[PDB]
Amino acid sequence: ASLTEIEHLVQSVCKSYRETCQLRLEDLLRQRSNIFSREEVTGYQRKSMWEMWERCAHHLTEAIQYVVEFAKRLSGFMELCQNDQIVLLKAGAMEVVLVRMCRAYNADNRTVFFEGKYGGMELFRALGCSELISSIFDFSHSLSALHFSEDEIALYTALVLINAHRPGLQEKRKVEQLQYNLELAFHHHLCKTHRQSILAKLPPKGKLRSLCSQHVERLQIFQHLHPIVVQAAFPPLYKELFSGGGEKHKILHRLLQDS
Numbered sequence: 570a571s572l573t574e575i576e577h578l579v580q581s582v583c584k585s586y587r588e589t590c591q592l593r594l595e596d597l598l599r600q601r602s603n604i605f606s607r608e609e610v611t612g613y614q615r616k617s618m619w620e621m622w623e624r625c626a627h628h629l630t631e632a633i634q635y636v637v638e639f640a641k642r643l644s645g646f647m648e649l650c651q652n653d654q655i656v657l658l659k660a661g662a663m664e665v666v667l668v669r670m671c672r673a674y675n676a677d678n679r680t681v682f683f684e685g686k687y688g689g690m691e692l693f694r695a696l697g698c699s700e701l702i703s704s705i706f707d708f709s710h711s712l713s714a715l716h717f718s719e720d721e722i723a724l725y726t727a728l729v730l731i732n733a734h735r736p737g738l739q740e741k742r743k744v745e746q747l748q749y750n751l752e753l754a755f756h757h758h759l760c761k762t763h764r765q766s767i768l769a770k771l772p773p774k775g776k777l778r779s780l781c782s783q784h785v786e787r788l789q790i791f792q793h794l795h796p797i798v799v800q801a802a803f804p805p806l807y808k809e810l811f812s813g814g815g816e817k818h819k820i821l822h823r824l825l826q827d828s
């Protein structure tokens with residue numbers, strides 16, 4: 570488009586992200602001294618596997634409801650066909666949740682905010698996927714060395730969400746031009762803010778696909794151990810995005826109709 574239209578894309582996205590944060594930043598920094606206790610950490614460790622899963626899936630789902638709203642406010646996004654809004658969310662909504670987690674992450678004690686207090690990766694030992702849990706801390710630890718601004722996180726998460734080369738898009742170019750316009754707003758704000766140099770420190774694209782692909786691969790395993798915990802206790806939007814078969818009940822386009 571134009572440089573003046575590019576100037577309010579930054580504004581539009583920075584507003585849509587600030588108005589769609591469950592996690593309010595200043596509330597998280599004012600709680601990193603509220604660190605979990607060995608007696609509470611062991612309490613989480615001694616919880617059954619499926620209960621730490623059911624509790625985290627429910628917490629992931631709550632974090633995706635705010636992403637689907639972020640997407641719903643991304644000007645240009647709801648001008649797209651339902652099949653393309655859902656496919657952008659179905660693949661990029663966990664990726665947005667993972668990049669937003671860098672704010673709930675404290676790199677000094679390598680702790681993450683969880684259920685009202687800050688805990689380490691040892692907190693999630695009962696889940697049985699220690700290798701994947703570690704890579705999410707190592708990933709949030711990597712973005713914490715980028716020292717993101719909330720405006721930077723806004724424009725980076727839209728580009729995580731608005732991906733023109735997702736498999737399954739009906740109309741590809743309508744996203745390419747929404748991606749390319751979003752891509753200028755990010756480079757222009759980084760230019761203005763004297764931050765063009767972080768474009769090379771950003772994680773390689775295939776780093777988020779690998780983290781989401783591990784989560785799907787580790788839900789597969791837990792589904793086999795606890796099948797009826799997924800059908801009975803797991804949230805439907807979780808099963809729709811991640812497990813198969815789970816899109817039998819399409820909660821996604823329910824949220825993309827009401828407004």
Ligand SMILES: O=S(=O)(c1cccc(C(F)(F)F)c1)N1CCc2ccc(OCc3c(Cl)cncc3Cl)cc21
Binds near residue numbers: 625
């Ligand atoms: O519960 S969070 O407040 C949470 C907060 C910090 C760290 C974690 C975890 F887990 F990364 F250390 C979890 N929340 C909000 C953001 C988020 C992302 C994924 C998630 O769960 C996915 C999952 C995994 Cl990665 C492994 N096994 C079962 C599941 Cl369902 C939960 C979640």
